[model samples]
Target chain A: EELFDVTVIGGGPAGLYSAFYSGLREMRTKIIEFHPHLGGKIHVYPEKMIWDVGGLLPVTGDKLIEQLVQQGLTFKPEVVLDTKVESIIRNQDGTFTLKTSTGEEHFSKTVIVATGSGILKPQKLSIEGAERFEVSNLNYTVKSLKRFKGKTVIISGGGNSAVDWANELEPIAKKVYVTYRKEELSGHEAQVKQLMNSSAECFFNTSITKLIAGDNHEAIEYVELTNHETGEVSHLPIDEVIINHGYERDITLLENSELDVAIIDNYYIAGNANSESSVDGLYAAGDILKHEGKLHLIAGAFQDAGNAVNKAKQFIQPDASEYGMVSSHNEVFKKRNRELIKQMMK
Target chain B: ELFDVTVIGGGPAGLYSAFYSGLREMRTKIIEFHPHLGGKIHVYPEKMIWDVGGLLPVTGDKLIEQLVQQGLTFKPEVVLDTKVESIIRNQDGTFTLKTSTGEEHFSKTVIVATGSGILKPQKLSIEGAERFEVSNLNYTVKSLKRFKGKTVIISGGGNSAVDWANELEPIAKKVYVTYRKEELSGHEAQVKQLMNSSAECFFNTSITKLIAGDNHEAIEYVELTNHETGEVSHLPIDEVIINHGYERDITLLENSELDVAIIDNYYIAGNANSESSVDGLYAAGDILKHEGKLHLIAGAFQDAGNAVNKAKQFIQPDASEYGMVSSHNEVFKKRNRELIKQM
Candidate 1:
């Protein structure tokens, strides 16, 4: 069995911090992310700016995630990418067995769970024949404003996401149109109101009834549509289509654990942070531990990392006869990735 | 009568934040203080390095007064360094009556409580030194960096002086210690071990004569006399730090209407971020509101500042309109100095 002092699950703000904190304690730590690259939703909208990080001014989503990744990897924890922990088996002897999706296994004395939202996914159109023109004219998410440059795109739905996409796409798209099943937008009311005042055109009670493809049989053309409340069917010309529907909450794995901590609304459990599980050497940090995003922020998550890493260090050794805080807990600690400990006031 | 929002007291942290916060929103405000320099703990320890605040690390006394001055001048509030009496009811409306020395003042919507620690002098021996400071002698050590390449002399054998000497000798060109008796006093094991190699010293030696520089007329040389032996000699030095011990008390301002939120009958009621008794107010930096001796240091002061600023903002309207952890709250706001000012 491969032995490690600590194993971090997932790589979002929580997981990254857990790994970083574990290293700060100098614990031999490892981070396992199913995705090839780190950073969760932070990678989605790189330019999105954030404030409230104590002393730091507002920063971009991409920049924050990049810095977090750099800091998390500072301990040089064995980062196993494209790997999934299928099961975290607690041995009768107190050690942990992490069985991966690829049939590989690793053993560790402690574990920190930071799997946020258990992986978020873009909502997709379940209608038949929707996937055929996904690349050419149909898209579930928009990555950049430049991608729709000069294109006439029809966005379905008038909620905040939909309205925001239309508003953001207006300057880039030529003759932008928004189609909604209802005249009143039920999404983020403020953003919808702001979007209604912008330049984008709106077609209420509208729905796409057919796959209007171009001559290439790949791109969308002047397509067919129908009023959801009426028998009337019409055709409108468009160069592209984007669905801005919202997301569904995913809390699957948490359902199986026997309520380890305080479950907030059955979503997030108030957890014992800093190191390994309630069963010695098992830790939890970030969103999963903090009343489930009750204190969700990069700064709060960073605090969780600091606490977890310090605890992880204590788990490996209590007396510290072998080395200093990190060296003794070096398995969890790495150079710049080290987590800062709270100084005890005398 | 001061119209509009009234900040009852002015201290270092309060006035600084009030001034800065007022500048953001042009509203009428006033600040009142009881002490001469405003907040308590007039005298801070020497050479203390504070790490908190936004960015800059500064002296404790300077930091406090600057914030108080900023609050006074910003005009958000008046620098009313008047002592408050009680929030007595008036025939017309609620007013705060302050019996300031021999004056009377009132405020509407008063912020009653304020924090203040006692002012106590640091002890030193062998006389006539306090009469000449910056000209001949000094008390606190600002940093160990400037002492490098300078022949420095420390006059105490206590924990403070010994730590200073040990931390400096690695960098300072030369270090000398003069005590009234044999054997260095503090951290006997560590001091005795380090002094053997890095520093030179004298036991039973004391300065008996003070001399001035020929050109500058400041400190030039002093005659050292062995306390046991009658022999006397002359030595030249750059700086001298005297550490005997100091005493401070803050519970003096534990006024009648105001109460310090006590925890477990010991720690003052502080938030996860350190908010104390009153709303829109806090107590931090050095003295722990109620509990004794919070060991004034760089880190403790930083925590105090962060807690105070965080607590003060609680008074702002719609401050908690959105939970900070909300997904929408994570959106990046533009870089605005007002949003994230440096300490």
Candidate 2:
């Protein structure tokens, strides 16, 4: 492909909106996502209902992402997945040369940094021999509920995921227990109430100190929890131990990039009103963006993407309009809409 | 009645924010400039909104209805069709809002959600059009059933025009659309529907004059002129539908002496956290501006909710914790469970 008009460096709501707007502005666009799938941080709670969106009413994270991807691709942007951008080399002509880990180099006129929260890895159990029990009795996230059916599961943490999993596994697991080091569970008031009222046992001011191996010496059979307040210890037979110590995020990609983009708090890319960074023709959005009035909500991310893409369009072609036409008056989808209409008739 | 929080502007942002505040067990009140609940959306009720987060393709009116219903869950006191003229800072950190109706209300904390500003409908420009407006001209579709068995003429070349034209075609005795442009500009689906409907469309045309009937209260006919050919024509109609769109005017806040930081126009000055320059008073929705702030309904919704949450903490110092999820909230759990069963 020739030099792309805009290269979006994220596939979350922010980058998705940027790609969609770039297409609306008649720009050739492409989206690069490090993960195999899109939706960024939303994949963590795909089934959770999102009520904060204005006109969307209430919808699950999965459903919202599905709708967003469908709407974002209405103009058809080249989506590159499982590829990491190694470096950004600015050309003498003000264009950018992006080198990816896949041994591919691409050129783009403008770039939008929407890499929200960067890539995150779940914090694993720190005890010795925990690696041996990973495949059998230890997990950071629940991939399948069937594995824990009829078995006692211990969730360690005091966040939404931990409290939610305790309730989710109550109907399936023989018994569910949540162990937190805090005096009160750090979850939201409602989730904390539900955790206390649920069939699951909640142990506050407690910490998991050791693990007991099974007969095969491979699977974890029991966990030793110590109550820091009373200096008392107890053992519970557990078929599973889910560590919800949150994720460790990595934003080192920007640090190693050839472009001298400014950073905020050693992580987020410092941007402004139009999501513009210090570098010309470069913008940032989503959680990776740092500003005085920045909100971490997905709605805010969408707005940041829109502003960044609009600014990027102006940078590419000075005479371009500040904003794209509303979807109703937009003619970019004329042929496609007509085809869809014809298909509906048939 | 003493309100724990007063939310100005009944748009989606303000409405959703009010709903969230209610969920937090706070006494709330809403002040709206327009008669309707939905703020900016009332302008294009029939038009579809496709970009707001989870909603794939929902009409403006339907979303407004949903938001209104959700907002009324706690039955907050709503003041409609009234404009806030000024704000008076009280001695005890509470604010008193003076309205155009000469009504004064007290609130401990305020959330300014007066989106963009007050929206005034675009009127018909033809001579004598204003005289018959009370009887024969309709600027908005308050009730679609009222136009049944009546002739209607719609003017404009936008999404609302086309959407309303298609919607009114089947019920009205006759429908006509006049626009100054050669091409039909609207949503593709509805424009396609208009092409197939019984409604007649006139392009490169403008309404010149409106004639009243013998009663002098109803519109009888309208004179049309063709810009491209200098041709003239007359059309007799029972009702004239004007969809010229709306203009955002921020004059209401100018009437008051209360000082507030403003940007661009009358947009309230606030920060990422939705706090305004004035302490104890907050702003949310599109009316509030900040760096990296988005002018989207989703952003408004989030902003309003954040403002309400912060207001809750301001009202009760001990309550610094965030509100719970709707699915698990004590007030909504049973209803949520009912909604989940069908899923």
Candidate 3:
């Protein structure tokens, strides 16, 4: 196994920036992400505008992800996607060995934990055979709007995701029905207004009780809903069913590790302003890291990432400088700087 | 005039704090000593800045434009070319700021973001050298294209001097660097590149005199004096650049009457949350020093936001310590809709 200088566990804003900064310090880096894609929880609301990220103007979540990924890959660290780090083991040689789901082991001199909110797995439907229809007419996420063209869709839940999907599909679907267990939608006021003013019909204080399969026995042909207030049952014919219930977060990586890392509220890693965890060779960043002065915003993640990288660099090389030189005076960016100036002149 | 928050300085930290203060729905005002904004960044407008997070490598000029535009989003009241002389706390639990113009402004809370104070460039000491400033003598490189296709002579041996010599060597017809030291004291890589490039280096030499042209406006020849050999040489030059560094004026903190704690008699000794010793007063950016403080522009941004939040709660005890995310915030809902339409 190749021994890397730094191994970042996550691919969100914090981890991505950590990889970039690590490369700037001339350290060999590797990033391991559980999701097939690089963006972390920001994928939850790709269309929402983000205006608080420092110098840039208002940008949507998807656009910010694109920009962050581009800046993250500037140094081209080894990226391992679709792999989950199972646990970490610190050896007597002062190095770390990371065991992954794929049974492959990664060795690194330092580890940065930037896992923001852990792996988000959508809450599944409770009906016995509902998962079989997931491949056909049952969906937990709306990956493409064109898939529901001219089709009757019934959405379950009353959160932001449910309201947003209902509003988006109101004009495309032949008919849209929203069934929720709450008396009123819990999304933002504007989103709730858009959903209410649309042609979509909402069934409040109701939840899906059963899934009726079609002749093929694979896709859902109808849904059985029960009204909690009236105790009345009704069946609705639908071509597709989408569930917008919240997600189940999996944070077993921290639990299973042998190192006794300090944790706060049994979720966030209790770290100092420098992003140093209790473990000797471990650090944390992003939302998972908690401190007195933590910003808890996307802008705050970048600072934590840089500080973590600086500390990690000094740990590996005791004689290294406290901080990396600014890009204007750095030799690593000479080639890219030339290319950028050329483009600017054009 | 009384305001909810008064930010002292117009640099990255102060400008950003002003913007955030407005976003928090506070009546904000900015007091800057310089005639224009952008703080010390105006010193190196042509250099490539790549350290700011999320932003690609951008020139200092472009970064300044972006920062100033973003800082002015909330339309805070701006007072320019006025230096804040001192701060006083009144019995009414409000702060009064005295400026160089003999004006007084009152605020509920104050945020100090003066990064290394007002920086003024150290000018050339030669007599009558000020006359060539309008034509050829330059204290800072504002435009790189102006030196193209011309012979340039840069004086000084610091990083600025060596970096400029290396940058201009590829564009200028001829580049000469005259330093009074034996070796160039810039970064090792930059000094090595300068020594290997086509540029000429004069060690232990100083520009003794500037010979003006027939117009008596622009410098035509520079008289160089060798300190060790006592030899004199003349070189015809198209431009003369003096990079003797800057003089920093940071007497505002010391001159203040309030008992604000300071570190090393320079920076405000504050906590990570940007709270100073005095109540209702905060510090941000390079002026605030703590164990976890970061000295980069990105770090300044975090400090600015934190200081604004603290200032907000100081004025309104029931207010939220943090501002809402811009996407869901009603303040930008209309603007966001318009931007979306343009997209």
Candidate 4:
């Protein structure tokens, strides 16, 4: 098994921050991300304006991701992407073992779990040539907000993203039509009310059956729509088609496999911000932390990663004692680690 | 009426750090020291450093002034070097403080009991140039064991320069003593014996400075006048001493001033790690503190200052909003300021 001081699970906010602070304290660290790339859900929308991030001016989602990604790179950590962590366990000498899907074992003294929400895929429309629309005119992410100015946009789905886009684009769009498969919007209350107040037209119980393209290999001219309640069909010409149907996620991978994770409601069982259930010498970072009392914000996640790095140093106190620092070794530590091992091993 | 916060007494630990932290938060601050130079006995040269006041590598006697002087340049605050008379409660939701020197009126708050301990000098006698020692005389040492290859003439039974003589003898040119008194006082038996092996001695005698030359400038040679035998002699010497003890006001200053209000924090608080009773106000190192049992040193004092500074900012919110960015909340600061005035 490979060895290091800290092993960060997931290359999200918690993972990257934990790694950064760990290196700052001069500890060896590594980060494991299952995706081919990092950035988490923030990468889903390119031009989405986010105002809630602390210390940043109202920045776009892609730009914020770039900045956070750069911050994680500041303290150069061993980042492994496109790799799946199949299992995490403890070795005979009490070191941790991370069994990757490729049958490789890695060891660390401490771990931080920042696995945010699992990968979510957009629910796509199924049609013969409908796939072409998604590959061309139909879009999931807007490259820029100003790109849709004065354009006639038709958006599907009654979720927050769809309704918010409809309301936000109404003033800029010549006309905006928001059609939903459901009779009423089942998303956030505020986004629905905002859409109702906007000058955009709303269609209920409507389904897009076909995309009629114009000119030779050109853009989508109209979407053939069908009302599920009345069996009525109509064609509406639109400059843009936005499919904002809710995405899907499978969080069971956090526990079901060989990781032997502790399960809580919708999350993993992490001890405070720095400790987690995966294995010894491992930690969890970002909004994915499964804990009782934690603010799922970027700042809070950053704090969690920082705290985990501190505790990770405590885990490697034997190696750290060579330095000029007093070692606080107690019987309570043994008992606590024993309990942690028992829970994680199960 | 003036002020939002009052800090009692002006000294290094209390004055510099307390005022700086307070000013950083945009709060009004004032420090009052009872009419004295460096509070009671601080200026006395013979005072031995017990606990180093926040100067991690300095003597308590020397660091005390350095820190207080540093505080003077940090920010302009009211420092009244006078005795306080009374704390009067005004009928118009305000408070008035009457002092020996002036009547200071304030709105809303009072910090009148903070204090820095006074230092007094011990007396030395019948050993060296008792009367004419100033022009070319060596009276005190702010630092210990820094004397290298220098002849030191200690003439006292007290543990002032005698301690220095013992500590520096192995490294100095030579050390001598001519005391009228026979036995040494003010030190432990072990220390007294250590002095005998460290410095050359000629007891039951006093000295009269003849020229004061050598490495130590001025009147270097002294006329060794024996007190017991009427024998008079001349000898070359480098330094002189009068180990007068100290008069510290920590005990008296810590006590409540009868009808007067308690000393405000910014001056003295016996709380842990030098933290004042007030939130975000910490007292650390040697200025004034609570833990008296621990031996004081530059290391411990530095530790105290660092810890207290850390804890001070830890408990305080660096900014009202999360993170360190300016936003639209700037416009609402006017309303927040108005609300804070009444509060």
User: Please, what are the lDDT tens digits per residue for candidate 3 over residues B1-343?
Assistant: 6899999999999988988887899999999988888987887787788767777777887888888888888999999998899999888889999997779999999999899899887888899998888899998877677787899999998999987888888778999999889988888977888888788999999999999968677999999999999999999999999988888889898778998999998999989889999998999899999888887888888898988888888888899879887756778867765765531
Error of 4 at A90 (Å): 2.9
Question: What does candidate 3's lDDT look like per residue over A67-131, in tens digits?
Answer: 88888888999999999999999888878999998789999999999999999888988878788
lDDT by residue (A1-346, candidate 2, tens digit) is 5789999888888888788778877889999988888777777766455665555566666777887787777678999998887777888888888888877987899988888888767887778777787777798776445567788899999887788878767867889999998987888787678677778888889989999987767788889999999999999988889899898876767777877788888888888766899889988988888776565567667777778877888898889887766654466755664454344333
Candidate 3: docking tier: acceptable
Sorting all predicted structures by DockQ, with the top scorer first, yields: 3, 2, 1, 4
Predicted complex 1: CAPRI docking category: incorrect
A204-296 per-residue lDDT for model 1 (tens digits): 788777777777677888767778777689888887888776665456545544324335566654454232344566666666664221234
Q: Please, what are the lDDT tens digits per residue for candidate 4 over residues B214-320?
A: 45436667678787778888876555554444555554333333232223532354343344443333343344444321212222222233332343344444633
What DockQ was computed for model 4? 0.03
RMSD of 2: 7.4
Chain B, TM-score, each prediction? 0.60, 0.76, 0.88, 0.55
Which runs of model 3 end up more than 4 angstroms from their true locations? A123-156, A164-243, B124-137, B143-151, B178-192, B201-240
Give the candidate number with the greatest lDDT. Answer: 3
lDDT (Cα) of model 2: 0.78
> Residue by residue across B165-217, what tens digits does model 2's lDDT show?
87677668999999989997786766888988798999999888888857667
The native-contact fraction of candidate 4 is 0.00
What order do you get sorting by TM-score, best first?
3, 2, 1, 4
Per residue, candidate 1 scores C-alpha lDDT tens digits across B293-343 of: 122222233233344334334545555422333123322222222332321
